[PDB]
Design an enzyme around this catalytic site. Structure first.
Site, PDB file in Angstrom:
ATOM      1  CG  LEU A   1       0.064   5.555  -1.363  1.00 32.81           C
ATOM      2  CD1 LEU A   1      -0.973   4.455  -1.531  1.00 32.81           C
ATOM      3  CD2 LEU A   1      -0.581   6.828  -0.823  1.00 32.81           C
ATOM      4  N   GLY A   2       3.952   4.205   0.309  1.00 26.94           N
ATOM      5  CA  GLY A   2       4.905   3.566   1.196  1.00 26.94           C
ATOM      6  C   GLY A   2       6.188   3.202   0.480  1.00 26.94           C
ATOM      7  CB  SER A   3       9.310   4.236   0.192  1.00 22.00           C
ATOM      8  OG  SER A   3      10.612   3.951  -0.292  1.00 22.00           O
ATOM      9  N   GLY A   4      10.276   1.260   0.953  1.00 28.51           N
ATOM     10  CA  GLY A   4      11.233   0.453   1.680  1.00 28.51           C
ATOM     11  C   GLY A   4      12.187  -0.141   0.668  1.00 28.51           C
TER      12      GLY A   4
ATOM     13  CG  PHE B   1      11.029  -4.562   2.298  1.00 25.12           C
ATOM     14  CD1 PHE B   1      11.373  -5.279   3.435  1.00 25.12           C
ATOM     15  CD2 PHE B   1      10.478  -3.298   2.459  1.00 25.12           C
ATOM     16  CE1 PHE B   1      11.198  -4.751   4.698  1.00 25.12           C
ATOM     17  CE2 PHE B   1      10.304  -2.756   3.727  1.00 25.12           C
ATOM     18  CZ  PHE B   1      10.660  -3.485   4.847  1.00 25.12           C
ATOM     19  N   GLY B   2       9.899  -2.489  -0.660  1.00 25.37           N
ATOM     20  CA  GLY B   2       8.636  -2.012  -1.195  1.00 25.37           C
ATOM     21  C   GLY B   2       8.636  -0.604  -1.760  1.00 25.37           C
ATOM     22  CB  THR B   3       8.774   1.137  -4.653  1.00 29.40           C
ATOM     23  OG1 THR B   3       8.756   0.040  -5.572  1.00 29.40           O
ATOM     24  CG2 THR B   3      10.186   1.309  -4.107  1.00 29.40           C
TER      25      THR B   3
ATOM     26  CE  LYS C   1       4.747  -5.519  -2.697  1.00 26.75           C
ATOM     27  NZ  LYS C   1       3.924  -6.576  -2.041  1.00 26.75           N
TER      28      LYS C   1
ATOM     29  CG  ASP D   1       5.200  -8.360   7.149  1.00 25.46           C
ATOM     30  OD1 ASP D   1       5.726  -7.951   8.193  1.00 25.46           O
ATOM     31  OD2 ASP D   1       5.118  -7.662   6.123  1.00 25.46           O
TER      32      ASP D   1
ATOM     33  NE  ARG E   1       6.394  -3.188   9.526  1.00 18.73           N
ATOM     34  CZ  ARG E   1       6.804  -4.407   9.210  1.00 18.73           C
ATOM     35  NH1 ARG E   1       6.488  -4.931   8.038  1.00 18.73           N
ATOM     36  NH2 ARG E   1       7.523  -5.105  10.067  1.00 18.73           N
TER      37      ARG E   1
ATOM     38  CG  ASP F   1       3.599  -6.811   2.900  1.00 20.44           C
ATOM     39  OD1 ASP F   1       3.928  -7.998   2.744  1.00 20.44           O
ATOM     40  OD2 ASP F   1       4.420  -5.878   2.887  1.00 20.44           O
TER      41      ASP F   1
HETATM   42  C1  LIG Z   1       2.331   2.707   5.539  1.00 21.00           C
HETATM   43  C2  LIG Z   1       2.267   2.879   4.011  1.00 21.00           C
HETATM   44  C3  LIG Z   1       1.112   2.207   3.292  1.00 21.00           C
HETATM   45  O1  LIG Z   1       1.020   1.018   3.386  1.00 21.00           O
HETATM   46  N1  LIG Z   1       0.149   2.996   2.517  1.00 21.00           N
HETATM   47  C4  LIG Z   1      -0.990   2.410   1.786  1.00 21.00           C
HETATM   48  C5  LIG Z   1      -2.193   3.152   1.592  1.00 21.00           C
HETATM   49  C6  LIG Z   1      -3.264   2.585   0.902  1.00 21.00           C
HETATM   50  C7  LIG Z   1      -3.172   1.241   0.376  1.00 21.00           C
HETATM   51  N2  LIG Z   1      -4.225   0.667  -0.310  1.00 21.00           N
HETATM   52  C8  LIG Z   1      -4.128  -0.579  -0.796  1.00 21.00           C
HETATM   53  N3  LIG Z   1      -2.964  -1.320  -0.614  1.00 21.00           N
HETATM   54  C9  LIG Z   1      -1.909  -0.813   0.042  1.00 21.00           C
HETATM   55  N4  LIG Z   1      -0.681  -1.585   0.236  1.00 21.00           N
HETATM   56  C10 LIG Z   1      -0.239  -2.606  -0.699  1.00 21.00           C
HETATM   57  C11 LIG Z   1       0.479  -3.705  -0.259  1.00 21.00           C
HETATM   58  C12 LIG Z   1       0.898  -4.689  -1.169  1.00 21.00           C
HETATM   59  C13 LIG Z   1       0.593  -4.553  -2.527  1.00 21.00           C
HETATM   60  C14 LIG Z   1      -0.111  -3.455  -2.966  1.00 21.00           C
HETATM   61 BR1  LIG Z   1      -0.554  -3.223  -4.825  1.00 21.00          BR
HETATM   62  C15 LIG Z   1      -0.529  -2.475  -2.059  1.00 21.00           C
HETATM   63  C16 LIG Z   1      -2.002   0.522   0.568  1.00 21.00           C
HETATM   64  C17 LIG Z   1      -0.906   1.095   1.269  1.00 21.00           C
END
Ligand SMILES: *CCC(=O)Nc1ccc2ncnc(Nc3cccc(Br)c3)c2c1
Length: 307
Positions: A23-26, A28-30, A50, A145, A149, A163
């Site tokens: 979904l998201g990439s950096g 710092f993050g995958t 994550k 933070d 995003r 996050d």
């Molecule tokens: C902009 C990209 C993004 O953040 N996409 C996204 C969609 C749905 C989600 N549902 C639940 N959590 C997250 N983010 C996240 C942050 C830190 C750790 C974890 Br396991 C998940 C998203 C993110």
């Protein structure tokens, strides 16, 4: 002294979830999107995973575990507007398991759904975040933070914060935290945070201001085409983010107030809740959006099945 945080973390197995896509990439993050099959039980639930590169460095495995702790700590009484850590799995890499929010990070949703976005919703959200961030303040923790995003969308009527990884929990007294950090989101930071490396609750209020700016500008980049190094130097010259085209002068004032140099002269979070709630009752007055009446977005949570 203080009360005990009796909340637990469900440490769960790898064999049970299957990660679909990222979904998201950096750097710092995958973070992935992946269904989870919960062992024996006849239930299947979607979820986001994550992960970071395999644990060449333990310090890396400590940093990720810190995030799991803090994210864990908040179930507390618990909040509607704050994301809850579901589980965790252990592997050369360490995996965090967070309940997935379908519409993704709010920032993207604004960029793609610029049409049909309501003059109502934008105001409603700010209340939503201001509600969420106060809960963090109540918990003596600074998210540290906050940004577009990092706000998730459960439904177009509901939004959540996420996050925590940078974020640091606070002991009593302990008014401010200073840390030597390699990487931070510079553009979303307060001036003292950039100069003195000091983070406060009012440091978060700044990031909130930039976040709402992102929302009101429909997911525009803060400072379009300006290097990260220069930023610390220009802000003391007095320059801030320009007025977003659609904001009534009342709203902009609130955005500017979050960017005051004096950390105390900024609004606290309860203040932000009350201000935006008051606006919310009559949004049309406080937000000029062309063709605002009749906008499309869907009240009952009707189907979003297609991928
Ligand atoms: C902009 C990209 C993004 O953040 N996409 C996204 C969609 C749905 C989600 N549902 C639940 N959590 C997250 N983010 C996240 C942050 C830190 C750790 C974890 Br396991 C998940 C998203 C993110």
């Amino acid at each position: 002294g203080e009360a005990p945080n009796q909340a637990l973390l469900r440490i769960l197995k790898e064999t049970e979830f299957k990660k679909i896509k990222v979904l998201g990439s950096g750097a710092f993050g995958t973070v992935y999107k992946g269904l989870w099959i919960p062992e024996g039980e006849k239930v299947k639930i979607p979820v986001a995973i994550k992960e970071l590169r395999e644990a060449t460095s333990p310090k890396a495995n400590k940093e990720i575990l810190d995030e799991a702790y803090v994210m864990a700590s908040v179930d507390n009484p618990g909040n509607p507007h704050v994301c809850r850590l579901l589980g965790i799995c252990l592997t050369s890499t360490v995996q965090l398991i967070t309940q997935l929010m379908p519409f993704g990070c709010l920032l993207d949703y604004v960029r793609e759904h610029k049409d049909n976005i309501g003059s109502q919703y934008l105001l409603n959200w700010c209340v939503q975040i201001a509600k969420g961030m106060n809960y963090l303040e109540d918990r003596r923790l600074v998210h540290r933070d906050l940004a577009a995003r990092n706000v998730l969308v459960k439904t177009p009527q509901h939004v959540k914060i996420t996050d925590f990884g940078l974020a640091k929990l606070l002991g009593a007294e302990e008014k401010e935290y200073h840390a030597e950090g390699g990487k931070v989101p510079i553009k979303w930071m307060a001036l003292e945070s950039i100069l003195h490396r000091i983070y406060t609750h009012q440091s978060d209020v700044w990031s909130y201001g930039v976040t709402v700016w992102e929302l009101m500008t429909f997911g525009s980049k803060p400072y379009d085409g300006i290097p990260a190094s220069e930023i610390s130097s220009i802000l003391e010259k007095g320059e801030r983010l320009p007025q977003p085209p659609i904001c009534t002068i009342d709203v902009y004032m609130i955005m500017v107030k979050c960017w005051m140099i004096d950390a105390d002269s900024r609004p606290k979070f309860r203040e932000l809740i009350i201000e935006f709630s008051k606006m919310a009752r009559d949004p049309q007055r406080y937000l000029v959006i062309q063709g605002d009446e009749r906008m499309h977005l869907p009240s009952p949570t009707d189907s979003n099945f297609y991928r």
